[PDB]
Amino acid sequence: XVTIDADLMDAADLLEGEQVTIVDIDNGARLVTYAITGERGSGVIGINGAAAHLVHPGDLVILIAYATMDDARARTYQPRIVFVDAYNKPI
Amino acid sequence: XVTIDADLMDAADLLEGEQVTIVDIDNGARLVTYAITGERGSGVIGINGAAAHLVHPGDLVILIAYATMDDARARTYQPRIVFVDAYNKPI
Amino acid sequence: XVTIDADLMDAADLLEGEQVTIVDIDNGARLVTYAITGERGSGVIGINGAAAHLVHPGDLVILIAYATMDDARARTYQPRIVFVDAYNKPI
Amino acid sequence: XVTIDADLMDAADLLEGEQVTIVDIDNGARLVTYAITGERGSGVIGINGAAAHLVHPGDLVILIAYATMDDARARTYQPRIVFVDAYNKPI
Amino acid sequence: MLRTMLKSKIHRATVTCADLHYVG
Amino acid sequence: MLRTMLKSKIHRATVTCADLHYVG
Amino acid sequence: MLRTMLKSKIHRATVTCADLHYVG
Amino acid sequence: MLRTMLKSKIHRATVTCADLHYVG
Ligand SMILES: O=C(O)c1cncc(Cl)n1
Ligand SMILES: O=C(O)c1cncc(Cl)n1
Ligand SMILES: O=C(O)c1cncc(Cl)n1
Ligand SMILES: O=C(O)c1cncc(Cl)n1
């Protein structure tokens, strides 16, 4: 894969190659892939390879990354939540 | 996403944002999502977003969380199992 | 979930509550569940709850557990592989 | 499971028994299995067991393995990406 | 060597609502 | 760096029973 | 004990393109 | 805090055989 605008990756604290869960609001597909850095400020959300069978252009998707951490850190860690407009620009 | 009554989250030792597996006894759907804290004592089990394609109102579901732990702790750790009535109140 | 004969759990080095992947040779279903200790020497392989929609009595299955380990241990680790007869007794 | 030519396993830095995600470009199937070392230089990509229901001879597939690492290493880590010809030989 | 173990189980809850278009 | 590796395999077991409405 | 927690979420993005035969 | 990152990729290999009844 999934190509993501570098601005959304920075906003969400995603690294190139980080595992990402894509869930498709339009058809209910759910899959696991990895993040590729896309042209900054382009608003690109690109589905690459076999994932393109399940997730299509024009679909609304949610992109999720998880982390494993010890009980103590889990109770204090604050996730990065990024809301976007119809053009995939942060709000 | 899954909105869970804060009482069931305390009873089950689940944090807001902890990864959760939902399995649907009615149709056999299985998906991975995260826990959101719901109104305490409301008995809410709320499916939000893409998951609503697979899990429907009135379905009986099992909600599961896993932990990664060293061999030593794994042999002694006791999981929190919460049984609920028809109104999603603990027993 | 999956109820497993305590002898197969010992043979395979599985703990009660350990995450288990079930893969079904008959219909190609693949799902994630956890191990429950079954009556020792009974040859029980019991599918409990939502999983019973996907994996059925008389199906040939493979049960898999994974571990996360450091690169160094991964290169030397020897998995427990348990072959069974038609009655789920180890060989 | 998946039998992989030992040359591709060395090229991709994959161990026997390492968890592998297979995604099928032809039919969009996605599954998780583990790597088995295949005859070196044979170009073998062998689907064994339940996976054969989903992934068929002549299908184009992508094989993916992941690693868990601390934030600091994650920002610098470079994955092993292996391109192959029509005969499954590295380029 | 880390194992994945069951930590939490809520058994046989009834889904009370579902919202495709939830925002939050 | 942690890798995910095969730890346990029970090969070609026969499912003996199923219960949709199991409690436990 | 390690928990799996939400780290990152991009909420309601629009897929702009797809390439079945991506090379990279 | 542990991240899951891509470690290995074999890109666009051709499946050479399939065996439903493999033993090993
Ligand atoms: O083809 C895909 O869907 C794809 C490509 N590269 C990695 C992964 Cl996990 N999936
Ligand atoms: O709509 C969904 O199912 C959804 C929403 N937010 C996160 C996840 Cl994993 N899923
Ligand atoms: O009904 C099931 O599939 C089930 C029951 N309890 C736990 C899990 Cl993970 N799955
Ligand atoms: O037959 C399969 O698909 C299979 C074989 N061994 C392990 C796993 Cl996870 N799957």
Residue numbers in the entry:
A (entry chain F), B (entry chain H), C (entry chain B), D (entry chain D): 25 to 115
E (entry chain G), F (entry chain A), G (entry chain E), H (entry chain C): 1 to 24
Paper text:
PanD is a proenzyme and in the structure, we observed the processed active enzyme after cleavage between Gly24 and Ser25, and modification of Ser25 to a pyruvoyl group (Pyr25). The active protein consists of a β chain (Met1-Gly24) and an α chain (Pyr25 to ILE115). Our results show that resistance to PZA in PanD mutants primarily comes from alterations in two loops covering the active site that have subtle, but significant effects on the affinity and residence time of POA on the enzyme rather than from directly affecting POA binding interactions.
We also tested PZA, nicotinic acid (NA), and two POA analogs with chlorine atom at the 5-(para) or 6-(meta) position. None of these compounds inhibited Mtb PanD at concentrations up to 20 mM, except 6-Cl-POA which was also competitive and slightly less potent compared to POA (Ki = 1.00 (0.04) mM, Fig. 1c). The ITC data fit to a single-site model, with a Kd for POA of 0.71 (0.03) mM (n = 5) and that of 6-Cl-POA as 1.09 (0.04) mM (n = 3). The molecular surface of the active site indicated there was room to add a substituent to the pyrazine ring of POA at the 6-position based on the pose we selected. This was consistent with the finding that 6-Cl POA was an inhibitor of PanD and 5-Cl POA showed no inhibition. A polder OMIT map showed clear electron density for the 6-Cl and it was oriented with the pyrazine ring in the same orientation as we fit POA. The POA binding pocket is relatively small (206 Å3) and not easily accessible, as there is only a narrow tunnel leading from the active site to the inside barrel of the PanD tetramer. With a diameter of ~3.4 Å, neither the substrate nor inhibitor could pass through the tunnel. The chlorine atom of 6-Cl-POA resides in this tunnel.
